[PDB]
């Protein structure tokens, strides 16, 4: 069901071309006939507004859209009742006969599990967990344990829920802990880092994404190129230049992801320019990475400007470490930027205490600030005193 949410995500914000929404509309129109998208199909106009969100023929009647295929018709209304009768009502009476005849135990549990997948096809999350709840008590091995997590995993991608999903995945792993292969383990790991992208946990999201293999494909839950983008792109913003050399630019897997799919242009164009110390052409690579990768992806729209700006802070940080100073004509001119725009980039970086440097006007000399003999025994050491002073007397002042 993620294939529908991935394509229909372009219907939210498109600043380049409308054809991106028209091409993605073919996947929405094709998959809605096989499986009912009605909960997400109505959620399109109920999620974001003032783009495509003002076009609905059911709840609120108005038309503002760049895509006219999101409106209800008489065909989807008739097929809504047909899918409920054929995929549920027809198969619910057959399982009801098995409960009355008392045939097997685990076989009856798998019947509600198989039937529960039809509720995801018609888009009913309430009865999907109800069918799995009856088979949860009969679940023993990982066959029926993972299938319950599959429906919970659909809540995150299909219904766009970052809260109730990750809470249930930690409970299933604590019940029966085996892990199977890497793909069954990535469902407890790779997806955990995906939910952390919404709350903006920085490295906590990319901890399990780097160690995750590039062969993970869940189809309905996630595709091959979906995990390929989330693992390769996020790992670049997290791992520093020390880890970029032995992991990102050199990998047995990541190098095969961008080679097969040329639409990434992230781990190649960005890392080579940082390795070759050429920042003249490094700037326009961020536009192709932001517009054609970060924007169209779903979970990569949470941060938005937090992506490039962090790289704009770290792109000069690498140059400051290799020289005790810097020239103005080699920075505000030769790199393609200007004097006023470079002053605005580095103007807000220093007061945030992320880095330290010196900028001059008359001489135009950019000097690098170094800790020298300060390091961690200057601030962190003094800060460590008050850091452990409050937490030590917190429980001691209350006695019992």
């Amino acid at each position: 069901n993620y294939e529908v949410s991935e394509k229909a995500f372009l219907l939210t914000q498109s600043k380049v071309s409308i054809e991106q929404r028209k091409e993605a509309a073919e996947f929405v129109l094709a998959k809605i006939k096989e499986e009912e998208m009605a909960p997400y199909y109505k959620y399109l106009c109920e999620e974001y507004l003032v783009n495509n969100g003002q076009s609905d023929l059911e709840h609120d009647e108005k038309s503002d859209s760049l895509n006219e295929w999101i409106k209800f018709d008489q065909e989807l209304y008739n097929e809504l009742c047909k899918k409920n009768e054929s995929k549920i009502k027809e198969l619910n009476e057959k399982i009801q006969k098995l409960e009355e005849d008392d045939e097997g135990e685990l076989e009856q549990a798998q019947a509600w599990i198989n039937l529960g997948e039809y509720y995801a096809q018609i888009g009913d999350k309430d009865n999907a967990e109800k069918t799995l709840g009856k088979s949860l008590s009969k679940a023993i091995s990982t066959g029926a344990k993972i299938d319950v997590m599959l429906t919970i995993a659909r809540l995150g991608f299909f219904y766009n829920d970052q809260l109730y999903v990750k809470e249930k995945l930690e409970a299933v792993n604590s019940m029966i802990e085996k892990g199977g292969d890497w793909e069954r383990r990535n469902r407890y790991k790779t997806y955990y880092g995906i939910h952390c992208l919404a709350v903006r946990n920085f490295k906590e999201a990319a901890k399990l994404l780097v160690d995750s293999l590039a062969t993970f494909t869940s189809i309905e839950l996630t595709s091959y190129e979906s995990i390929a983008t989330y693992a390769s792109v996020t790992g670049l913003f997290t791992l520093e230049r020390t880890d970029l050399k032995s992991k990102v630019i050199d990998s047995p897997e990541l190098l095969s992801l961008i080679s097969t799919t040329a639409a990434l242009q992230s781990i190649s164009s960005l890392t080579i320019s940082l390795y070759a110390s050429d920042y003249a052409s490094y700037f326009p690579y961020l536009l192709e990475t932001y517009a054609n990768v970060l924007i169209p992806c779903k979970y990569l729209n949470r941060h938005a400007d937090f992506f490039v700006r962090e790289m704009r802070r770290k792109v000069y940080a690498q140059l400051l470490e290799s020289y005790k100073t810097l020239s103005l004509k080699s920075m505000a001119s030769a790199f393609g930027v200007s004097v006023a725009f470079l002053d605005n980039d580095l103007g807000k970086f220093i007061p945030n205490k992320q880095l330290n440097c010196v900028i001059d006007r008359v001489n135009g000399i950019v000097e690098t600030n170094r800790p020298d003999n300060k390091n961690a025994q200057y601030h962190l050491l003094v800060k460590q005193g008050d850091g452990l002073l409050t937490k030590l007397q917190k429980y001691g002042a209350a006695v019992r």
Binding site: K15, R200, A280, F283, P284, L287, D305, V308, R309, R312, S333, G336, V337, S338, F341, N344, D345, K348, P351, N352
Partner: peptide, 27 residues
């Protein structure tokens, strides 16, 4: 946690960097 999350910037989006591609050929 200071000058980070909600304040943001409200610049450095499109129009500022889009002009920088023209400056490379003007030198």
């Amino acid at each position: 946690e200071n000058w980070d999350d909600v304040e943001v910037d409200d610049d450095f989006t499109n129009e500022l960097k889009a002009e920088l591609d023209r400056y490379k050929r003007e030198n």
